[PDB]
């Protein structure tokens, strides 16, 4: 809870920056500043319109390679046991499987479209 | 003063996670999910977990970033609703909150609650480790498995992930 | 050949979407033989952006 | 039944099966399987629009050979399974005497019967 | 009974009811599937740490890598659904009528 | 005779029928050998 | 629940009336709440007021079936005093069927309900009195 | 859809089912069910149309929520007595959740609302392979965890599954929904006998898979989705008619044909217990699920509908499809009455 103490002090610092932004300097005359600005002209609607995106495979690609990051990240505790053979073998097999999946979707233009 | 701190962090987790699963707009749901994942990492960390909570914080949180990318890309309403906008959304959120406060009430002023099991009302410094002179640090050697003893398991897991990659590519390719 | 054979109205009975009609069966339709329902047009996401003056 | 040779998991036949006689020549069940193999060959000639009972005789003999072989091994495993069922039953008979009492078979001189004469 | 188990089972049941009743967004359904993953994760991990049964700490890492690739599969399916329609609503799925 | 642009088959190959007859006669020989072994084992054990 | 169907079997048969009839109303109202929950979850009654109305109709009709069945069971058991024959519950099932026909305001469905409910209720009492076990031995 | 990749995905379906069959560790069973799901998604969408897209959506949602409920059951099992053996459980609540997760997976009457939806829009190869494997693999797990099941759960799901699979099957003028309702009825039968002698259930599994293989092979022989097309395959292909006759009567369950050995052996080792009212109720409902077979057989072969021409064009071209293994599976499915003492091949 000492890092929670640090989080508490930074929360109090951030809220005092909010209050010193809002309440101290001057007045608050609204009613045209609140209008949505794009580049000089009043546009149609707003955001939250259906915004069809370019990449489809790339976010799922990130997700699955983050999952193999999750399986690979205990490498230092891999490196200290009496079974060196299975250690090095399954480590090489996991990275080689990662490279195999990458090589498949690299050769099958899974990244060469709307990137 | 506090000694129920894991129960307290679990109450904050249940609040953020009921507001998560009450289904507002999914960006507000992801706000709830990042709050819930952060305090759940805090629960398992302050319980005695060394790294695995910060690990799942990282992994699960990058997954939520991908979920944000798709909920922005695909379909939103003309005006997205928040928790306190609708009849049904506000009703489910406040009644989940009421279930939370009601179980806090019927634990803190009572002995036990037996809805599905006899739940003992007192914080979990019991039962707990009586200071084992380990130095092997259980979670470190625990994830130092999957590699010494874990032969078949990483084989089928990585094979499932490779099949997952070719499956995603061929589902989008199936046009 | 003098033997009775099943006919067009028996064929109309053993077809359609579902066999036995109700007050609610009018919304069901026989499936397409291609199993494909193509036509719809999605151009509402021709989303505008004013790359403006300043 | 649950094993009872749940030690060797897929021992298809132990040396325990090598003490009972195998299914003999011209037993009627393997002849039934052979007739079923000939019927399979007949219908395989029937589907492909080739002449039935013609021009597929190597396929006829192939189907008959395959079904007779498979049915022979199935009959062997079958007879082993019923033999080990019988032997375990008799071991449990000879094991516990007192739960299976010899019923004192009273002859009909004294066994009374309700009659209810039907007219 | 370790009282934190009650609130985590409560969070599981609420996430399950949220998975079952849902208004219009299949995105939210995948999101509650992700939350239910997290609930089973935290409960199994606190089990393993109460038991000191640290040979089998395979439940957390492997449960969540598998259920996260399930969520990735669902996200690609939602990509395909929103491709072949305008949106991903529960309505305009009522074709293929039973 | 009567055909145009090929008979697709009807003139068979000479590996498939030889393969099928060979494995069929092989399986017959193996089952006969199996039955002789089993009769020998039964009469040797009892 | 199994505890209160066991309460319905707990009354001697015999008569301890208002209690056998209240247990019958409780069982019927529970079954009506079950069927109303299905029929409100599989229809979208659109809207909640009509959903309350349909659940009220199904619960009140099933509880009235239970009530009329318990009434004629109690009266037949008091009058004829025979716990052996299930003919009392044959009369009971036909009375429930005719009142189901009255609550649906048809006659052919009501006569069929008399026939089927009377035969099944006589079967229930008949198999309970001779003794046919519920769902299992589960031994061999 | 490169054919090497299709062989890979079929081998992963095989691998998921073998991992289910092979382990004592519960997480490996969950991995097997999940890998089965992941690879059984793209056996669907072999075509392009969005019917397969929505069917894969509905199937994925129900299959994954059943798998997560099973993981809940395993995790509560190890909240209690902590072992990784597939054995008698040590929680009635976990056995409740586990039976309901398997009930959602392999199809039961409160839980079957995805089955005609998934089988309607997909091609026949995907439908065949999902019916065979997705009704095979959790029977292994059920066979393993049978000694700790409240009998009310399995029995109520089985009774209600048979009667719902019967009552739904009478109306559909499709073919895949008839086959799916029949699948629900047979899964109710194959679950109903589990707690008494499971050799009956697993031999019913063998016979039902042989029957469904013959059915979908005879529908791969000619691209038919309505009974109108079945009448036109009467007029174009005559041996198909009598095979549909024999196999449909064998799905009916008539004694001189081999559709009887599943039901009657079940009734034997069922009524050696003191349950008599329940087998006669179940078998009267098995009389009920035969009428749609009868009208299907009427529409195929016993009556002769008027047929559209261009079959005059089609008569020069014989049935040049591929058959998986049609005659062997056929005469194994039909002429196997007198081998009822191949009951004991199973254990
Ligand atoms: C027409 C209904 C036929 C029911 C099947 C025939 C039968 O055995 O009925 C007895 C069954 C149940 O009777 P039972 O076979 O359980 O009787 C056993 C009797 N003791 C316990 C004394 C050994 O009755 C029904 O199915 C009623 C309908
Ligand atoms: C005590 C003894 C009881 C004996 C009961 C025997 C079964 C009852 C009678 C069976 C025959 C019924 C029959 O043939 O009904 C005809 C009807 C179809 O005729 P129709 O509606 O005119 O359709 C024309 C469209 N071609 O067919 C139908 O609508 C069939 C409806 C299903 C009937 C299944 C058989 C009864 C199962 C009961 C389960 C409980």
**Phi then psi dihedrals of residue H144, to 5 deg:** -75, -40
CB H93: neighbour CB atoms within 10 A?
16
Q: Are H178 and H169 a contacting pair, CB within 8 Å?
A: yes
CATH homologous superfamily for the domain A1-108: NADH:ubiquinone/plastoquinone oxidoreductase, chain 3 (1.20.58.1610)
What's the rounded Cα separation, in Å, for the pair B147 and B149? 6
Query: Looking at ligand 1, which residue's alpha carbon is closest to its atom 1?
Result: H280
Rg (CA), chain C: 25
Rg (CA), chain G: 17
Q: Are G33 and G59 a contacting pair, CB within 8 Å?
A: yes
For chain H, give the secondary structure using H, E and C. Answer: CCHHHHHHHHHHHHHHHHHHHHCCCHHHHHHHHHHHHHHHCCCCCCCCCHHHHHHHHHHHHHHHHHHHHHHHHHHHHHHCCCCCCCCCCCCHHHHHHHHHHHHHHHCCCCCCCCHHHHHHCCCHHHHHHHHHHHHHHHHHHHHHHHHHCCHHHHHHHHHHHHHHHHHHHCCECCCHHHHHHHHHHHHHHHHHCCCCCHHHHHHHHHHHHHHHHHHHHHHHCCCCCCHHHHHHHHHHCHHHHHHHHHHHHHHHCCCCCCCCHHHHHHHHHHHCCCCCHHHHHHHHHHHHCCHHHHHHHHHHHHCCCCCCCCHHHHCCCCCCCCCCCHHHHHHHHHCCCCCHHHCCCCC
Domain CATH number, residue E2: 1.10.287.3510
Please compute, for residue A40, the number of CA atoms within 13 A of its CA located in the half-sphere on the CB side.
5
| Torsion angle, alpha carbons of H92, H97, H102, H104, to 10 | 140
**Phi then psi dihedrals of residue H172, to 5 deg:** -75, 125
What's the rounded Cα separation, in Å, for the pair H120 and H112? 14
Interface of C with H (CB under 8 A): 5-8, 10-11, 14-20, 30-31, 33-37
Domains and CATH numbers, chain B: 2-172 (1.20.120.1200)
What's the rounded Cα separation, in Å, for the pair H210 and H201? 14
Mention every residue, 6+ apart, whose C-beta is less than 8 A from residue C19: C13, H170, H171, H172, H173
Mention every residue, 6+ apart, whose C-beta is less than 8 A from residue D15: none
Q: DSSP states of B25-58 as a string?
A: -HHHHHHHHHHHHHHHHHHHHHHT-SSHHHHHHH
**Phi then psi dihedrals of residue G20, to 5 deg:** -60, -40
Ligand 2 site-directed mutation target among H281, H291, H293, H305, most atoms within 8 Å of CB:
H291
What's the rounded Cα separation, in Å, for the pair D54 and D45? 8
Strand runs labelled E in chain G: none
Describe chain F by its helix, strand, coil percentages, rounded to 5.
Answer: 65, 0, 35
What's the rounded Cα separation, in Å, for the pair H168 and B42? 51
Q: Is G133 on the interface with H (CB under 8 A)?
A: yes
Specify the 3-state DSSP secondary structure of G117: helix
Instruction: Tell if the CB–CB gap between F42 and D72 is shorter than 8 Å.
Output: no
DSSP lists the bridge partners of residue C18 as H172
Q: Are A70 and B59 a contacting pair, CB within 8 Å?
A: yes
Q: Is G140 on the interface with H (CB under 8 A)?
A: yes
What's the rounded Cα separation, in Å, for the pair C28 and H50? 18
Rg (CA), chain H: 21
Specify the 3-state DSSP secondary structure of G101: helix
DSSP lists the bridge partners of residue E25 as E89
Position of tokens 């039934």?
Answer: D32
User: Which residue in E has a C-alpha nearest to residue H52's C-alpha?
Assistant: E96
Indicate the residue of H27, H53, H72 with minimum beta-carbon distance to E59. Answer: H27
CB A22: neighbour CB atoms within 10 A?
9
What's the rounded Cα separation, in Å, for the pair E58 and E50? 15
Q: DSSP states of A63-112 as a string?
A: HHHHHHHHHHS--TTTTSSS-HHHHHHHHHHHHHHHHHHHHHHHHTTSSS
Cβ burial F3-13 (10 Å sphere, 16+ → b, else e):
eeeeeeeeeee
* Pairs of CB atoms within 8 A across A/B: 105
Number of structural domains in chain E: 1
**Termini Cα distance of chain E:** 47
What's the rounded Cα separation, in Å, for the pair C10 and C7? 5
Of H77, B86, B96, residue with least CA distance to E15 = B96
Please compute, for residue B166, the number of CA atoms within 13 A of its CA located in the half-sphere on the CB side.
23
Chain centroid to CA E71: how far?
A: 8
User: Which residue in E has a C-alpha nearest to residue A59's C-alpha?
Assistant: E72
Describe chain E by its helix, strand, coil percentages, rounded to 5.
Answer: 70, 0, 25
Helix E26-51 and helix E58-84, axial crossing angle in degrees, nearest 10 = 180
Query: Looking at ligand 2, which residue's alpha carbon is closest to its atom 27?
Result: H291
Specify the 3-state DSSP secondary structure of D53: coil
Chain centroid to CA A27: how far?
A: 38
Q: What is the DSSP letter of G128?
A: H
Specify the 3-state DSSP secondary structure of B146: coil
* Cis peptide bond N-terminal to B11, omega within 30: no
Q: Nearest 5°: CA angle at H244, between H241 and H248?
A: 145
* C37 contacts in chain E (CB < 8 Å): 95
Instruction: Tell if the CB–CB gap between H273 and G132 is shorter than 8 Å.
Output: no
Output the CA H277–ligand 1 centroid distance in Å.
6
For residue A71 the two structure tokens come to: 């399986």
Q: What is the DSSP letter of B113?
A: E
Instruction: List the single best residue of A53, A56, A57, A68 to mutate versus E (max E Cβ within 10 A).
Output: A56
For residue A115 the two structure tokens come to: 């990137």
Query: Looking at ligand 2, which residue's alpha carbon is closest to its atom 30?
Result: H291
What's the rounded Cα separation, in Å, for the pair H141 and H98? 10
Query: Looking at ligand 2, which residue's alpha carbon is closest to its atom 36?
Result: H288
What's the rounded Cα separation, in Å, for the pair H206 and B63? 42
Instruction: Residue count of chain F, please give it.
Output: 46
What's the rounded Cα separation, in Å, for the pair H26 and A74? 24
Query: Looking at ligand 2, which residue's alpha carbon is closest to its atom 13?
Result: H291
Nearest ligand 1 atom to alpha carbon G132: 16
Instruction: Tell if the CB–CB gap between A38 and C49 is shorter than 8 Å.
Output: yes
Which parts of D2-110 fold into alpha helices (H)? Answer: 28-47, 57-95
Ligand 2 and H291: CB distance under 6 A: yes
What's the rounded Cα separation, in Å, for the pair H250 and H293? 10
What's the rounded Cα separation, in Å, for the pair H57 and E88? 11
CA–CA distance from B9 to each of A91, B15, B47, H151 (Å)? Answer: 37, 10, 11, 41
Q: Are G113 and G98 a contacting pair, CB within 8 Å?
A: yes
Q: Are H123 and H176 a contacting pair, CB within 8 Å?
A: no
DSSP lists the bridge partners of residue E89 as E25
What's the rounded Cα separation, in Å, for the pair H32 and B119? 34
Q: Is D84 on the interface with F (CB under 8 A)?
A: no
Q: Is H239 on the interface with G (CB under 8 A)?
A: no
CB H239: neighbour CB atoms within 10 A?
14
Instruction: List the single best residue of A36, A39, A42, A54 to mutate versus C (max C Cβ within 10 A).
Output: A39
Cβ burial H185-200 (10 Å sphere, 16+ → b, else e):
bbbbbbbbbbbbbbbb
Ligand 1 and G132: CB distance under 6 A: yes
Question: How distant is the Cα of E74 from the closest Cα of chain A, in angstroms?
Answer: 10
Of E61, B133, B7, residue with least CA distance to H27 = E61
Mention every residue, 6+ apart, whose C-beta is less than 8 A from residue E78: B70, B74, E26, E27, E30, E88
| CA pseudo-torsion sign H330, H332, H335, H337 | negative
Q: Are B44 and B53 a contacting pair, CB within 8 Å?
A: yes
DSSP lists the bridge partners of residue B113 as B119
Specify the 3-state DSSP secondary structure of G85: coil
Cβ burial H31-46 (10 Å sphere, 16+ → b, else e):
bbbbbbbbbbbbbbbe
Cβ burial G49-62 (10 Å sphere, 16+ → b, else e):
eebeeebeebbbbb
Instruction: Tell if the CB–CB gap between H173 and C5 is shorter than 8 Å.
Output: no
Of D61, D56, D32, residue with least CA distance to D44 = D56
CB G30: neighbour CB atoms within 10 A?
17
Q: Are E77 and H57 a contacting pair, CB within 8 Å?
A: yes
Question: How distant is the Cα of H61 from the closest Cα of chain E, in angstroms?
Answer: 8
Q: What is the DSSP letter of G83?
A: S
Please name which ligand lies nearest the alpha carbon of H291: 2
For residue C29 the two structure tokens come to: 């339709």
Q: What is the DSSP letter of B120?
A: E
Chain centroid to CA H193: how far?
A: 16
Query: What kind of experiment solved this structure?
Result: cryo-EM
Enclosing domain of residue H312: 1-347
The backbone region for B150, taken as left when phi is positive above 0, alpha when psi lies in -120 to 50, beta otherwise, is beta
DSSP lists the bridge partners of residue G85 as none
Breaks (C-N over 2.5 A) in chain C follow: none
Please name which ligand lies nearest the alpha carbon of H299: 2
CA–CA distance from A43 to each of A35, A51, C53, D97 (Å)? Answer: 11, 16, 14, 97
The backbone region for B135, taken as left when phi is positive above 0, alpha when psi lies in -120 to 50, beta otherwise, is left
Please, which chains are in contact with F (at least 3 CB pairs closer than 8 A)? D
CB H218: neighbour CB atoms within 10 A?
21
CB H271: neighbour CB atoms within 10 A?
13
Position of tokens 């509908």?
Answer: H305
Of H16, B151, A68, A98, residue with least CA distance to E69 = A68
Specify the 3-state DSSP secondary structure of F13: coil
* Cis peptide bond N-terminal to H71, omega within 30: no
Specify the 3-state DSSP secondary structure of B119: strand
Structure resolution, Å:
4.2
For residue H250 the two structure tokens come to: 């064998």
DSSP lists the bridge partners of residue B112 as B120
What's the rounded Cα separation, in Å, for the pair H166 and H109? 11
**Termini Cα distance of chain C:** 90
Q: Which long-range contacts (CB under 8 A, 24 or more apart) does A70-77 make?
A: A70/B55, A70/B59, A70/E61, A70/E64, A70/E65, A71/B146, A71/B154, A71/B157, A71/B158, A71/E61, A71/E65, A72/A98, A73/B55, A74/B143, A74/B144, A74/B146, A74/B147, A77/B140, A77/B141, A77/B143, A77/B144
What's the rounded Cα separation, in Å, for the pair H199 and H201? 5
């Amino acid at each position: 809870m000492n890092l929670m103490i640090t989080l508490l002090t930074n929360f109090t610092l951030a809220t005092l920056l909010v209050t010193i932004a809002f309440w101290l300097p001057q007045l608050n005359v609204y009613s045209e500043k609140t209008s949505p600005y794009e580049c000089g002209f009043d546009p149609m609607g707003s955001a939250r319109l259906p915004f069809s995106m370019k990449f489809f495979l790339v976010a799922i690609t990130f997700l699955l390679f983050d999952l193999e990051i999750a399986l690979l990240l205990p490498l230092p505790w891999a490196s200290q046991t009496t079974n060196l053979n299975t250690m090095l073998t399954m480590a090489l097999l996991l990275i080689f499987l990662l490279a195999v999946s990458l090589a498949y979707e690299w050769t099958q233009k899974g990244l060469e479209w709307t990137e | 003063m506090m000694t129920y701190i894991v129960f307290i962090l679990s109450i904050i987790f249940v609040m953020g996670f009921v507001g998560f699963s009450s289904k507002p707009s999914p960006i507000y749901g992801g706000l709830g999910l990042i709050v819930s994942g952060g305090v759940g990492c805090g629960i398992v960390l302050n319980f005695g977990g060394s790294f695995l909570g910060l690990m799942v914080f990282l992994i699960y949180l990058g997954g939520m970033m991908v979920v944000f990318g798709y909920t922005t890309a695909m379909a939103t309403e003309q005006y997205p609703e928040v928790w306190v906008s609708n009849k049904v959304v506000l009703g489910t959120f406040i009644t989940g909150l009421l279930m939370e406060f009601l179980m806090v009430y019927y634990v803190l002023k009572d002995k036990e609650v037996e809805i599905v099991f006899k739940f003992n009302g007192m914080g979990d410094w019991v039962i707990y480790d009586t200071g084992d002179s380990g130095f092997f640090s259980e979670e470190a050697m625990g994830i130092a498995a999957l590699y010494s003893y874990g032969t078949w398991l990483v084989i089928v897991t990585g094979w499932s992930l490779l099949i997952g990659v070719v499956v995603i590519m061929e589902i989008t390719r199936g046009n | 050949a003098r033997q009775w054979q099943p006919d067009v109205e028996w064929a109309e009975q053993y077809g359609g979407a579902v066999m036995y009609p109700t007050k609610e069966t009018a919304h069901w339709k026989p499936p397409p033989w291609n199993d494909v329902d193509p036509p719809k047009d999605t151009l509402v996401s021709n989303l505008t952006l004013n790359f403006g003056p300043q | 039944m649950t094993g009872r040779q749940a030690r060797a998991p897929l021992q298809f036949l132990p040396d325990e099966a090598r003490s009972l006689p195998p299914p003999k020549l011209t037993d009627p069940r393997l002849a039934y399987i052979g007739f079923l193999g000939y019927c399979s060959g007949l219908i395989d000639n029937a589907i492909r629009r080739r002449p039935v009972l013609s021009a597929g005789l190597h396929r006829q003999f192939l189907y008959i050979t395959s079904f007779v072989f498979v049915g022979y091994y199935l009959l062997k495993r079958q007879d082993y399974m019923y033999a080990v069922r019988d032997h375990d039953m008799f071991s449990y008979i000879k094991s516990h005497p007192e739960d299976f009492p010899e019923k004192d078979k009273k002859t009909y001189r004294e066994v009374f019967e309700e009659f209810h004469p039907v007219r | 009974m370790s009282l934190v188990y009650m609130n985590i089972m409560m969070a599981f049941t609420v996430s399950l009811t949220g998975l079952l009743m849902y208004r219009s967004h299949l995105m939210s359904s995948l999101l509650c599937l992700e939350g239910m993953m997290l609930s089973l994760f935290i409960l199994a991990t606190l089990m393993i740490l109460n038991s000191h049964f640290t040979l089998a700490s395979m439940m957390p890492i492997i449960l969540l890598v598998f259920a996260a690739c399930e969520a990735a599969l669902g996200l690609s399916l939602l990509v395909m659904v929103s491709n072949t329609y305008g949106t991903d609503y529960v309505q305009n799925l009522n074709l293929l009528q039973c | 005779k009567f055909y145009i642009q090929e008979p697709p088959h009807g003139s068979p190959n000479w590996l498939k029928v030889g393969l099928t007859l060979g494995t069929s006669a092989f399986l017959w020989i193996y089952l006969i050998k199996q039955h002789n072994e089993d009769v020998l084992e039964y009469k040797r054990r009892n | 629940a199994k505890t209160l169907l066991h309460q319905y079997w707990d009354i001697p048969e015999g008569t301890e009336c208002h209690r056998k009839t209240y247990a019958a109303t409780s069982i019927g109202g529970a079954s009506g709440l079950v069927v109303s929950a299905y029929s409100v979850a599989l229809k979208t009654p659109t809207s909640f007021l009509e959903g309350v109305a349909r659940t009220g109709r199904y619960t009140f009709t099933a509880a009235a079936i239970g009530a009329i069945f318990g009434l004629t069971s109690c009266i037949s058991a008091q009058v004829r005093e025979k716990p052996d024959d299930p003919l009392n519950y044959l009369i009971g099932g036909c009375a429930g069927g005719l009142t189901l026909g009255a609550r649906t305001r048809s006659y052919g469905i009501g006569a069929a309900a008399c026939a089927y409910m009377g035969l099944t209720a006589a079967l229930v009492k008949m198999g309970q009195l001779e003794g046919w076990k519920v769902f299992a031995e589960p031994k061999v | 859809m490169n054919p090497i990749i299709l062989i890979i995905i079929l081998m992963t379906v095989m691998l998921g089912t073998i991992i289910v069959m092979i382990s004592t560790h519960w997480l490996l069973i969950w991995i097997g069910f999940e890998m089965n799901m992941l690879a059984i998604i793209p056996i669907m969408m072999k075509k392009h149309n969005p019917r397969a897209t929505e069917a894969s959506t509905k199937y994925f949602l129900t299959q994954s929520t059943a798998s997560m409920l099973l993981m809940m059951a395993i995790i509560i099992n190890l909240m209690f007595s902590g072992q990784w053996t597939v054995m008698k459980l040590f929680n009635p609540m976990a056995s409740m959740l586990m039976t309901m997760a398997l009930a959602m997976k392999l199809g039961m009457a409160p839980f079957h609302f995805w089955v005609p939806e998934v089988t309607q829009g997909i091609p026949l190869s995907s439908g065949l392979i999902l019916l065979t494997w997705q009704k095979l693999a959790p029977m292994s797990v059920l066979y393993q965890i049978l000694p700790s099941i409240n009998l009310d759960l399995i029995l109520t799901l089985s009774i209600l599954s048979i009667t719902i699979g019967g009552w739904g099957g009478l109306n559909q003028t499709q073919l895949r929904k008839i086959m799916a309702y029949s699948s629900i009825a047979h899964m109710g039968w194959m679950t109903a006998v589990l707690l008494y002698n499971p050799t009956m259930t697993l031999l019913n599994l063998i016979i039902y898979i042989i029957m469904t293989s013959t059915m979908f092979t005879l529908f791969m022989a000619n691209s038919t989705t309505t009974t109108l097309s079945l009448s036109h395959t009467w007029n174009k292909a005559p041996i198909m008619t009598i095979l549909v006759l024999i196999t449909l009567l064998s799905m009916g369950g008539l004694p001189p044909l081999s559709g009887f050995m599943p039901k009657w052996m079940i009734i034997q080792e069922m009524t050696k217990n003191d349950s008599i009212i329940l087998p006669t109720l179940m078998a009267i409902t098995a009389l009920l699920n035969l009428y749609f077979y009868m009208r299907l057989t009427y529409s195929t072969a016993l009556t002769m509908f008027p047929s559209t021409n261009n079959m005059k064009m089609k008569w020069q071209f014989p049935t040049t499809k591929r058959m998986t293994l049609l005659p062997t599976m056929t005469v194994l499915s039909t002429m196997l009455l007198p081998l009822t003492p191949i009951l004991s091949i199973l254990e």
